[PDB]
Amino acid sequence: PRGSMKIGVFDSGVGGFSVLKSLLKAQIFDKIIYYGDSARVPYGTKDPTTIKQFGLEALDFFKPHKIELLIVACNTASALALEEMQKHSKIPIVGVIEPSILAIKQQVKDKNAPILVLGTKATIQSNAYDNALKQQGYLNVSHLATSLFVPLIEENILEGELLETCMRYYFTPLEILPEVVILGCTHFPLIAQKIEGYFMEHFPPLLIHSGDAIVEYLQQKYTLKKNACTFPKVEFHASGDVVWLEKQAKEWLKL
Amino acid sequence: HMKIGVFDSGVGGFSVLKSLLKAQIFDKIIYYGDSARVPYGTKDPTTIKQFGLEALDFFKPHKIELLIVACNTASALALEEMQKHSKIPIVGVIEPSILAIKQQVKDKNAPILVLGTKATIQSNAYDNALKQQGYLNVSHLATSLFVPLIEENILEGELLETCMRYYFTPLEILPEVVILGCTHFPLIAQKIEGYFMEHFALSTPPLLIHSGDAIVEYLQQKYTLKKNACTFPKVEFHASGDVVWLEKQAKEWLK
């Protein structure tokens, strides 16, 4: 319904490239300013106060770039900092949590369906996803903090016994067999097939992808046509070495 | 001299602090973990160098007479720059470990394996220091994933064993000495000894070089401090993240 060209994308590091990939594939925006807090990544192992402050400082970064909409690609910042970012900023901020709730409403008509939330420690300890799902009447929601997937994925460990063992470590205690599996972390789309293949091979579920969900939400909220910019302009900024972050983008975006 | 600072990226430095407290050589210790920004090991030298200079600003109001850089990554990359901007002595954990090796490894051809973060290994600080002393049979191995595994309190079981098998299977030189060039690795020291004993059938394990024990000897000799003097040293904990969170980990790491 609303109007809204130049976009910002905030993430703790290179994980947000999974959201940038969705944005770029949808071809909805012509200019995107990506900022990864790669000097301080990860956020998910840290405390709400630290993370909330990180989100507010991300706003200070974007202020000189005259963006019209800020996407918080980071599920951790979305879960912990979004409300504070919203109150301190004059521009719209859309996180990757709320859009996934809407996507589930649209894709999961069984309100009793087992749902499994995967995320960082901070995301899962916030109960952000559980609360929002309960508010929408879902009654059978489990959560699981798969902290070590982040560093594993960042070391390009996308297969093998070390990934399979880490999944065993985290998934084995699960009680309910999920019918929905929320990838509530920027990183986890890069192992989505393995996560689907684990729950199927040790007992596929509807995998909710945060990037795809935020894209669909933005089309509805702002009436944005796909294929409206064939080559969007993406600028990369980082608190750490920007060349390191741009080189990672080359890998994450061709994946 | 009397009141010292201890700097680490986070809670790993408790391995060095544990050594310092057991030796009972200092009366007052100001520990500072940059837990908002940990880890350093996956980041770039420029970022890490700046982290080291900012740590110096933290200790300025505390009026310390000595700063221990417990972090091997900051020691490898930031120590020299830190010292140039500092009016007090700064001691890292790399150079003292070379001295412990000079003292314990008379065979300069003994195979030595240095373990540390990617940034530490990439700096080659250990290899360069060891070469400078006549040690020719030297290998370096970045074991990045040990850090997040240890912080998740995974000090045993199959996930850790698979991770050691991931990093060690490629080793060409069966080491006689393993340098624990990372604050976290002492917590799996016995596991590292156990691995080599199993997968290479030895009776005695490699010599393990503990960074904290190395710096303790160095400091007692350098400042001629009396071991077992202060029976209950004073330790103040500060963090860039939630200091209660850092103090809770300290309880576990110091046990």
Ligand SMILES: Cc1nc(-c2ccncc2)sc1CN
């Ligand atoms: C698909 C893709 N798109 C990229 C891009 C787009 C816009 N601006 C910068 C980079 S890279 C890439 C493959 N690695």
Ligand SMILES: Cc1nc(-c2ccncc2)sc1CN
């Ligand atoms: C468990 C433990 N905790 C120590 C401590 C804590 C805080 N301040 C000073 C010393 S020592 C120790 C065992 N040796």
Ligand SMILES: N[C@H](CCC(=O)O)C(=O)O
């Ligand atoms: N971006 C974070 C994952 C990496 C981190 O811990 O910062 C998230 O989506 O939860």
Ligand SMILES: N[C@H](CCC(=O)O)C(=O)O
């Ligand atoms: N303290 C670091 C390990 C953790 C980090 O990477 O920050 C070291 O000694 O190498």
Ligand SMILES: [Cl-]
């Ligand atoms: Cl650099």
